[PDB]
Symmetry: D2
């Protein structure tokens, strides 16, 4: 999107707390989370978790 932090296919991980890592497969927006992403785990195919942008970091 002309503005999003990440794009479909970006490989990301959660920065802290419970772990999660995999590819960006989607997106969501609410008043509480105005920029959120859906992420399919690379260890467990098919399982997707949603998180706010702040919780995620791209993997370099």
């Amino acid at each position: 999107p002309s503005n999003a932090t990440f794009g479909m296919g970006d490989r990301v991980r959660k920065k802290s707390g419970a772990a999660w890592q995999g590819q960006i497969v989607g997106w969501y927006c609410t008043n509480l989370t105005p920029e959120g992403y859906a992420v399919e785990s690379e260890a467990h195919p098919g399982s997707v978790q949603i998180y706010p942008v702040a919780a995620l970091e791209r993997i370099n």
Copy 2:
């Protein structure tokens, strides 16, 4: 999207099993769920659940 069953803001509910109802706030796609939606509950603001298109119906 030039093709999606639902659009942001559509009011939907789960057709069966565990209940869920509210507005479409997002979208996701995986091999397992090639057309999925994120839905923020209208009863519990801020809480979003993700589901495959098949599980949802627009509320008329």
Copy 3:
């Protein structure tokens, strides 16, 4: 349990952020969340969310 903050059937709600309210239906424990509860929403029968004890408050 001879020690738990809440019991099955306790009516609770999330204290802040995304909302959630309903009855305690279960329990879990990990290193990250050594005291956690499963809660079935009272607005959406059948839908359960899990949270750490800290996030919940009994409803008086």
Copy 4:
């Protein structure tokens, strides 16, 4: 429990669809899922998902 299919610490996996594998860390019961388990992924420490007994199999 004098009756449960699995016990805390059992190593299990989801039988089909989205994958999930790890240890049993908890339990829940609703009318919809009268026997459910919380499972912490062994690939993503700290992340727990809940499922009905039917969806899981112990790993031998």
